[PDB]
Amino acid sequence: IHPMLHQNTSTFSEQRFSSTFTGEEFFLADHVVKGQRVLPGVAYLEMARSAMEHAVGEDVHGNTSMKLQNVIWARPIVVGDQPVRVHTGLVLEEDGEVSYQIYSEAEGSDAEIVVHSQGNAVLTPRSELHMLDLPVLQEQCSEQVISSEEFYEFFSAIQIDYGSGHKGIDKVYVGPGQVLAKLILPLSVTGSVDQFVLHPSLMDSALQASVELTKPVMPFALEEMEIIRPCTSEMWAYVRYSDGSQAGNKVEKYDIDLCDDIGTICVRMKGFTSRVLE
Amino acid sequence: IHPMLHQNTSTFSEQRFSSTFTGEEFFLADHVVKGQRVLPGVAYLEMARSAMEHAVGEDVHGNTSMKLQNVIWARPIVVGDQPVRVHTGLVLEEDGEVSYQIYSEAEGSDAEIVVHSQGNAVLTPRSELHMLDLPVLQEQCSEQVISSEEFYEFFSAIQIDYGSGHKGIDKVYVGPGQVLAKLILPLSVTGSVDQFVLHPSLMDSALQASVELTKPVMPFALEEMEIIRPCTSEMWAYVRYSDGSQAGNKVEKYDIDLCDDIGTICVRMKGFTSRVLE
Numbered sequence: 223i224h225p226m227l228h229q230n231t232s233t234f235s236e237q238r239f240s241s242t243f244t245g246e247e248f249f250l251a252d253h254v255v256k257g258q259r260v261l262p263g264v265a266y267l268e269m270a271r272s273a274m275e276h277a278v279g280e281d282v283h284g285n286t287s288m289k290l291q292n293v294i295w296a297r298p299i300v301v302g303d304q305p306v307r308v309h310t311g312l313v314l315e316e317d318g319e320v321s322y323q324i325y326s327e328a329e330g331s332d333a334e335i336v337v338h339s340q341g342n343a344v345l346t347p348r349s350e351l352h353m354l355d356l357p358v359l360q361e362q363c364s365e366q367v368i369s370s371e372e373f374y375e376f377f378s379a380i381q382i383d384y385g386s387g388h389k390g391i392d393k394v395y396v397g398p399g400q401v402l403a404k405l406i407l408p409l410s411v412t413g414s415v416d417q418f419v420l421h422p423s424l425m426d427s428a429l430q431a432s433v434e435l436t437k438p439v440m441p442f443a444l445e446e447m448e449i450i451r452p453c454t455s456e457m458w459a460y461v462r463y464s465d466g467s468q469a470g471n472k473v474e475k476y477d478i479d480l481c482d483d484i485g486t487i488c489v490r491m492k493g494f495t496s497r498v499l500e
Numbered sequence: 501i502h503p504m505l506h507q508n509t510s511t512f513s514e515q516r517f518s519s520t521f522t523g524e525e526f527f528l529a530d531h532v533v534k535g536q537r538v539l540p541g542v543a544y545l546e547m548a549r550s551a552m553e554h555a556v557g558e559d560v561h562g563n564t565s566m567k568l569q570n571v572i573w574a575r576p577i578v579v580g581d582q583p584v585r586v587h588t589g590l591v592l593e594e595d596g597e598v599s600y601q602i603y604s605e606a607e608g609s610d611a612e613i614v615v616h617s618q619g620n621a622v623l624t625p626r627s628e629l630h631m632l633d634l635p636v637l638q639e640q641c642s643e644q645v646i647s648s649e650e651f652y653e654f655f656s657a658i659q660i661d662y663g664s665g666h667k668g669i670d671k672v673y674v675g676p677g678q679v680l681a682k683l684i685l686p687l688s689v690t691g692s693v694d695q696f697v698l699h700p701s702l703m704d705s706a707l708q709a710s711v712e713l714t715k716p717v718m719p720f721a722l723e724e725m726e727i728i729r730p731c732t733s734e735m736w737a738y739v740r741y742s743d744g745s746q747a748g749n750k751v752e753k754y755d756i757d758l759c760d761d762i763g764t765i766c767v768r769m770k771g772f773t774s775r776v777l778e
């Protein structure tokens with residue numbers, strides 16, 4: 223169905239989308255964490271996204287702008303020479319919201335369910351197509367500059383080995399409480415672009431920039447995510463603090479924005495919390 | 501998923517199983533009706549069956565014996581050099597029953613739904629494994645005997661051309677208000693046997709015997725169907741009148757039973773009405 227959403231395993235008890243990740247996938251071969259083979263927090267969002275679209279059928283006109291609220295991450299998925307089957311389960315609220323979970327079932331005990339990520343999803347009309355000032359942004363973000371290699375080499379010191387596919391970051395501009403970052407899709411994943419709406423390669427890269435506040439940092443809680451246009455054309459990301467004043471080495475809360483060449487915002491994050499891996 | 505149930509296209513509005521039949525299928529290449537390429541009334545039952553099993557998930561022990569009640573047929577599916585997509589839609593009743601429909605959407609107007617078969621499905625504990633008297637049955641069914649060729653040649657006069665795959669009938673014994681029939685799976689479909697539970701080749705053949713009361717006869721209304729063991733081992737069918745005394749050239753109501761070599765009843769029909777094609 224979708225590179226992270228393989229088939230529909232829905233019964234009368236649940237709306238379900240099951241997926242099996244051997245390890246051959248690019249997002250699972252170019253994002254190494256603590257030595258183990260781990261799926262990125264951003265991938266959980268595109269499953270919840272592509273679940274939702276398919277959990278809704280033929281409909282006349284209407285609004286399409288999907289808003290993912292109060293997303294959380296509990297336990298990363300580790301892939302060790304054993305195919306893992308992951309289940310994305312949806313529940314429609316009487317009010318109209320949709321809550322979701324992304325769990326799996328262990329190969330040792332199938333009667334046990336483990337939750338890797340939760341949240342809510344609601345469909346929403348489009349607001350104004352907010353456009354960021356691409357020339358003005360670099361002006362304030364002229365204090366420090368980091369190149370791709372140095373950026374990625376900095377992670378390898380923390381032992382977070384981003385392979386070819388996740389090398390989407392490019393130039394990185396720092397300002398005061400401002401972050402900017404040009405990012406481009408990698409050549410390896412040239413073809414595979416029209417299969418995704420929230421392409422992991424660029425998105426995770428956008429999340430990678432948020433760590434430039436400075437142990438492996440892991441997505442913890444995102445309180446809002448707004449999708450407008452497909453995350454393909456967009457090669458610019460912009461990270462700033464959220465108006466919470468909550469800064470520290472264990473909990474940090476940001477507002478990230480990705481945008482087209484022109485600067486048309488296509489994805490918009492708010493309240494994104496990152497937490498250290500133990 | 502299943503040779504007549506291809507994938508699961510379920511949304512929050514409906515439990516769905518969509519299937520596309522090009523015409524290459526055996527049950528759609530060996531059952532010609534009025535010159536047009538038509539799907540057999542029996543195939544609608546195995547979709548409703550295999551829908552149901554998959555519309556129910558992981559469960560601890562429990563009863564498995566699926567009972568299809570008040571099945572009806574409205575409009576045959578005609579396949580004319582154009583792939584047709586057929587949708588099997590399920591609805592769970594508060595009481596516990598499950599009603600179903602098997603519709604499609606036309607290639608000229610997609611906003612229109614056409615219903616080919618309806619009914620109810622309920623899950624039920626197994627009753628006693630009723631066994632028929634195979635030696636005693638031929639005793640009373642010794643009045644008239646028809647061979648395979650003559651049987652099938654009789655249909656071709658009505659222009660119902662059963663090809664290799666639907667040539668499952670063998671010996672046919674007639675008694676007074678009794679019908680018997682040995683039937684065997686065809687060599688063409690030797691491999692494809694473990695893919696079905698209600699194998700069309702034998703089942704339709706069992707329905708073919710019911711017409712031996714004597715225009716193309718078409719299944720109209722079956723008020724009960726009970727499945728116990730997979731319709732693979734079973735090579736014997738037995739057709740008798742239902743205790744309704746409702747006999748005639750337009751409406752006829754029977755009780756068919758299929759059974760193993762030994763005689764273990766695996767499928768059991770009751771109240772099966774057949775009606776003439778206009």
Ligand SMILES: [Mg+2]
Nearest residue numbers: 234237512515
């Ligand atoms: Mg439902």
